[PDB]
């Protein structure tokens, strides 16, 4: 991959470009995702339900185009060619929003003023939805291939600093751009995300000589499908396909097929992990609005509570906790780090159950009204800083489980399908988000009504969020027991 001379400098300019093209591809994803519903409910007039459904369709495309944005990378174009293609759409879609916001050109694109603009928003969102679902499956294996020459020790040290750079785009975008959008303007606010992705396309292209790339091999999939047809239409059942067993196929080819049959059961065991992890991202923010916020205030800053620890725990975990666990033989595998990470998610949901339970006690005595993001909430008279204990326990769960889920998906996939297997990883995380979104509605049915009284921008004091968190912990203690069963069988047969 790299010549002997100058190797050290050739993998610091190949990991500086990949890590500086994920900080800028991410600072332009929270620029559009963060203050979207607020933007649409402006003087010029979507409703509460309509505005959100554009932010739920936009995310749906992001998860559902990863596996198909990976198959395209390992069959036709390759990881480098397809990332440049994706960032072209990502930029092309991102140019609709500045035009829509600007009163000068808003009429031309949206159309005649209603003396709305649904056509330009969806064409803008779909293209951005395609760009972020295909860049997100091809930069993660492409980044870690630069340093793979130095063994698994160097691959792990990459995903530590590839996840500290994605979380440095949340703090930079949810903090900087969000403030500019609400207060300064929306033409300026939505123009920085379009410029940021412009630089990412150029920095990635300019560093074309540092990267080490491999030509696509389309015959990997064509053979793989045939193996399935032969086995299903005719010891694991894939053994027959080998020549040694009388089948008409090679030996190593059948090995790749048997590698996908074993990886898949592990991914299906993480759907309960994502479900009880995207619900704590959403329900926590609802709880914070109902606590005494210290004495406008963008509603985005309430979301970066946990992306300011992952910014200060990874440097600590990458220089003080990793080496200590290395010299001692204590936790080498990657499916043993995930099972540890799924334990702090259990204690985090349970921790927030006690905080909420006492909070409902206070409101019955007295409440203090406050306004956040132009609406009013009946917050309790308890400081928001009581919510630190439930966010630290999530700072330790996005270090053992988010950074070890990527490492396992990459290091346990055939070398001919390393983008279609990170693509699936990010598609089974979508199945996780939408399973939970259905779980919230179920528990909010008239029969149970633990959150029936809740509505858009609605008070939750009448609701009972206390019981909901305990349910998240219960469904997270069950999966932890299950994931140990499947994890043990995977390593045993490995």
């Amino acid at each position: 991959g790299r010549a002997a001379i100058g190797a050290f400098h050739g993998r610091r300019l190949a990991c500086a470009a990949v890590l500086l093209a994920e900080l800028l591809e991410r600072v332009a994803f929270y620029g559009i995702t963060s203050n979207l519903v607020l933007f649409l409910n402006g003087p010029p007039d979507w409703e509460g339900a309509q505005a959100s459904q554009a932010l739920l369709l936009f995310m749906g495309i992001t998860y559902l185009v990863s596996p198909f944005g990976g198959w395209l990378a390992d069959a036709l174009l390759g990881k480098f060619g397809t990332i440049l293609l994706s960032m072209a759409l990502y930029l092309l879609g991102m140019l609709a929003f500045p035009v829509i916001a600007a009163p000068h050109t808003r009429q031309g694109l949206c159309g005649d003023i209603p003396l709305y603009c649904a056509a330009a928003t969806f064409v803008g969102l779909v293209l951005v939805g395609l760009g972020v679902g295909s860049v997100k499956a091809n930069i993660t294996p492409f980044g870690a291939d630069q340093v793979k020459d130095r063994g698994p020790e160097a691959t792990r040290r990459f995903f530590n600093w590839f996840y500290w750079s994605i979380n440095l785009g949340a703090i930079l975008s949810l903090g900087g751009i969000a403030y500019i959008q609400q207060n300064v303007s929306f033409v300026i606010g939505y123009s920085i995300p379009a410029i940021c992705i412009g630089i990412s396309f150029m920095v990635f292209l300019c560093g074309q000589s540092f990267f080490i790339t491999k030509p696509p091999d389309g015959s990997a999939f064509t053979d793989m499908f045939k193996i399935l047809a032969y086995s299903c239409c005719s010891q694991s059942l894939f053994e027959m396909a080998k020549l040694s067993r009388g089948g008409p196929f090679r030996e190593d080819k059948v090995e790749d097929v048997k590698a996908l049959v074993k990886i898949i059961p592990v991914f299906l065991a993480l759907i309960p992990y994502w479900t009880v992890y995207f619900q704590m991202q959403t329900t926590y923010v609802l709880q914070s609005l109902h606590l005494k916020i210290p004495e406008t205030f963008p509603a985005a800053w309430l979301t970066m509570f946990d992306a300011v620890l992952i910014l200060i725990l990874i440097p600590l975990k990458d220089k003080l906790v990793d080496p200590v666990l290395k010299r001692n033989g204590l936790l080498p595998s990657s499916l043993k780090r995930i099972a540890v990470g799924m334990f702090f998610v259990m204690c985090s949901a349970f921790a927030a159950g006690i905080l909420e339970s006492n909070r409902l006690k206070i409101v019955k005595v007295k409440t203090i009204n406050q306004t956040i993001g132009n609406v009013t909430y009946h917050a309790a008279d308890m400081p928001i800083w009581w919510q630190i204990p439930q966010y630290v326990l999530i700072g330790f769960s996005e270090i053992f489980a988010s950074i070890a889920g990527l490492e396992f998906a990459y290091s346990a996939a055939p070398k001919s399908m390393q983008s279609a297997i990170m693509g699936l990883f990010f598609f089974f995380s979508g199945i996780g988000s939408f399973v939970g979104s259905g779980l919230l509605a179920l528990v909010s049915i008239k029969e149970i009504g633990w959150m029936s009284n809740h509505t858009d921008f609605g008070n939750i004091n009448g609701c009972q969020l206390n019981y909901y968190f305990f349910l998240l912990a219960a469904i997270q203690g069950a999966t932890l027991l299950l994931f140990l069963i499947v994890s043990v069988k995977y390593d045993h047969q490995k």
Epitope: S219, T222, F225, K226, A229, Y230, C233, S234, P248
Partner: nanobody, 124 residues
Framework: QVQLVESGGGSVQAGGSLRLSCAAS????????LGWFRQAPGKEREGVAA????????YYADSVKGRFTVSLDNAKNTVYLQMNSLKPEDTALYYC??????????????????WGQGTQVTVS
């Protein structure tokens, strides 16, 4: 890159039988399906039967079921199309083709890539 050699063409009367064979010269691998297409003069092309080189399943056209048989011979690498109970309506030109993908459609002509010269068969 792949070329098919036809053979066995001929003409017979009503009630006769024939054994058509179309050989191949391209890569034995990289080929998933083989099919036979019958097209009368000045008439739209139509498919007769298809055969898969990995499973062996045969998809005989609904209009010619029960009167034509197709088999594969790996050793000879040349498929055969046995025919019986020939009728004048079968009088037409015949083509053999291969493809790199057939899990979509085994008979639709808009899938096969490589084609052959074809052979004319007349039934009187």
């Amino acid at each position: 890159q792949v070329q098919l050699v036809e053979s066995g063409g001929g003409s017979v009367q009503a009630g006769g039988s024939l054994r058509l064979s179309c050989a191949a010269s391209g890569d034995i691998e990289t080929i998933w399906y083989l099919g036979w297409f019958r097209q009368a003069p000045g008439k739209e092309r139509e498919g007769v039967a298809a055969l898969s080189t990995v499973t062996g399943s045969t998809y005989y056209a609904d209009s010619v079921k029960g009167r034509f048989t197709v088999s594969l011979d790996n050793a000879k690498n040349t498929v055969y199309l046995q025919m019986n109970s020939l009728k004048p309506e079968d009088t037409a030109l015949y083509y053999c083709a291969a493809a790199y993908t057939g899990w979509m459609a085994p008979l639709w002509q808009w899938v096969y890539s490589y084609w052959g010269q074809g052979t004319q068969v007349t039934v009187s």
